[PDB]
Structure 1
Amino acid sequence: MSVGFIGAGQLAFALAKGFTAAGVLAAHKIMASSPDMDLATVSALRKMGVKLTPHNKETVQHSDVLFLAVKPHIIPFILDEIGADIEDRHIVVSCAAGVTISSIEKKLSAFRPAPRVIRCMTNTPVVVREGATVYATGTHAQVEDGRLMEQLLSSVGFCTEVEEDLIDAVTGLSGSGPAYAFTALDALADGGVKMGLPRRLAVRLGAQALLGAAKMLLHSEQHPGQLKDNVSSPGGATIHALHVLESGGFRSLLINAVEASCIRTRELQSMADQ
């Protein structure tokens, strides 16, 4: 199997870092192309052993699975450039937020019939092999292509198939999720610093607390409210802190965030289709 990346941004580096750390891909079996060959991420890939080239056509010719790791508004221009170079062996995997399978297939179909397209939403934690990935299969993605992509993406985190009409909501939850967590961890650390902890120790403790709680939930058959109840001793410090969260509408803010991200994702695609 030969994997290629169109784009050499953060997600291209993240996935190639995870894939090779997982030992599922030899770094030299991965080719990446960038329009800005002086990127910080392009220099990192060259050290890993990832083959590099400025021409997207080189990436198409050298790969079987083809990740589109470009900005959403760049997808149509990439598809126009490489469309005549797609062969029957290709699986085209768009990672762009919002961009639909139908729009990709329509562009590629003008060149050759029956493009094999898969759409996915992943996130940056694939770089430490703890990503969250969903994918949906296009019209001509044979039953094997989805299972192949799930095997590949499972090596860097959780991965499952969804209906495509859920991917915008997933984007608002696990696609944007890490940024919510980085904000929360920065603020939790400021809280620790306010109460007298050194900054380095506060970041470590807050981050370990979030990782541990999330692992607990994933490994538990209990509701998050039940796990919350087990932390909060009657009259104790935790339930006092939980109350001030509630007084600020903490829960509503995170609902607001998933909603706003999902709505914007739909808007960006409506702008694309217009």
Structure 2
Amino acid sequence: FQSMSVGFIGAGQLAFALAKGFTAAGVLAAHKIMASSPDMDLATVSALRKMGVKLTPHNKETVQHSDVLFLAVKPHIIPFILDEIGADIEDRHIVVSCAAGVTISSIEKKLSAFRPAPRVIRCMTNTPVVVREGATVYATGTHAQVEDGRLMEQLLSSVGFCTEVEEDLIDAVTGLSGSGPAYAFTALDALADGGVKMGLPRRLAVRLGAQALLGAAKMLLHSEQHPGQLKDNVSSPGGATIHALHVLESGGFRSLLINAVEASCIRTRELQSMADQEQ
């Protein structure tokens, strides 16, 4: 009953996932969302159009429509966008940057040249908001009101987990839960290949592997136990599971997942350093 108007600058995968999640949650009407993109011939744009989201090529129209304005363009596009519509940001706006790596400081520096106290929030979310099981963190900017952070948390909690963090954690969150779903999709493809190798039909192997991962993740979320203790409860002495865990260990399975989180976090920091030098 808030009747919030939401805009997305950028009408790609994340704008679609968030719009789909918000509308499935019943927090927003699809036609109260407006998204802009210069390439109005993407599949994401077509899917947004079918949902009933309003679409325009003009970023200024998205700004003027919006109360909450999500920045959902590639990180290197954010400064061009802030130059373009910075004069259109109003005191009523909450600007939510979803761009990987882009700092609140960089955004406020651009926008403060126009109005003195732009309300900026930075978030890192992930594509599972599309099924309302996202993992979201956010940090509040210099001029964001206490009510702004609470509004953001309410909105993003409707599509998954949401919590406030200090901004200096967000690049690490990006490497864990931002990139996380891609590690899981890779793992599920491989587990299914394993099931197929041992004689299962592919359709059944995909379903079983995905259900196994979902159930295990839910167990851990609902348990106060260490993941190692939960692992111990699966493995009977001499049994099949502990034999399988040994071959994972012999390949350095754990180290590969640590490598992945690190690589994603470092690349996030490295891109932003490139961005800050280009300014």
| Interval of TM-score (by shorter of Structure 1 and Structure 2) | over 0.9
Deviations 1:186-235 (A, max 9, x none): 00001001001111111110000000000000011111001101100111
Question: Aligned with 1:171: secondary structure?
Answer: helix
Q: Distance in 2 between matches of 1:24 and 1:271?
A: 37
| Cα displacement (A) at 1:80 | 0.5
Partners of 1:153 and 1:209 in 2: how far apart? 27
SS for the counterpart of 2:162 is strand
Q: CA deviation at 1:37?
A: 0.4
Distance in 2, matches of 1:182 and 1:239, equals 24
Distance 1:205 1:259 in 2: 29
Structure 1 position 103, deviation (Å): 0.2
- Provide the C-alpha distance between the structure 2 equivalents of 1:170 and 1:221, rounded to a whole number of angstroms: 22
What TM-score do the two structures reach when normalised by structure 2? 0.97
1:173 corresponds in structure 2 to: 176
Q: Deviations over 1:135-174 (max 9, x none)?
A: 0000000111011000000000000000000000000000
TM-score by length of 1: 0.99
Report the CA distance between 1:107 and its aligned residue.
0.4
Identity over the aligned pairs, expressed in percent? 100
CA drift at 1:268: 0.3
Deviations 1:22-81 (A, max 9, x none): 000011111111110011010111111111111000000001000000000000000001
* Unpaired runs of at least 5, structure 1: none
3-state SS in 1 of match to 2:91: coil
CA-CA distance at 1:111 after TM superposition: 1.0
Spell out structure 1 runs of 4+ moving beyond 2 A.
none
State the distance in 2 between where 1:14 and 1:48 align: 11
- Pairwise CA RMSD: 0.6
Instruction: Give 3-state SS (helix, strand or coil) of 2:258's partner.
Output: helix
Q: CA deviation at 1:112?
A: 1.0
Matched, 1:133 2:136: yes
Q: 2:80 aligns with which of 77, 92, 95?
A: 77
How far has the Cα of 1:258 moved from its partner? 0.5
Question: C-alpha distance in 2, partners of 1:84/1:110?
Answer: 9
The match for 1:115 is: 118
1:10 CA drift (Å): 0.3
| Aligned partner of 2:212 among 209, 212, 232 | 209
Q: 1:64 aligns with which of 63, 67, 75?
A: 67
1:186-225 correspondence runs (5 A): 186-225=189-228
1: CA distance between counterparts of 2:192 and 2:57? 42
Distance 2:56 2:270 in 1: 34
CA distance in 1, matches of 2:228, 2:28: 40
SS at match of 1:159: strand
Structure 2 Cα separation of the partners of residues 123 and 272 of structure 1? 22
1:121 Cα offset (Å): 0.3
Are positions 1:25 and 2:28 aligned together? Answer: yes
1:4-33 deviations in Å (ceiling 9; x for gaps): 110000000000000000000011111111
* Structure 1 counterpart SS, 2:123: strand
Distance, in Å, in 1 between the alignment partners of 2:66 and 2:200 is 50
For 1:149 and 1:186, how far apart are their aligned partners in 2? Answer: 34
Give distance in 1, aligned partners of 2:199 and 2:17.
Answer: 35
1:90 is displaced (CA, Å) by 0.2
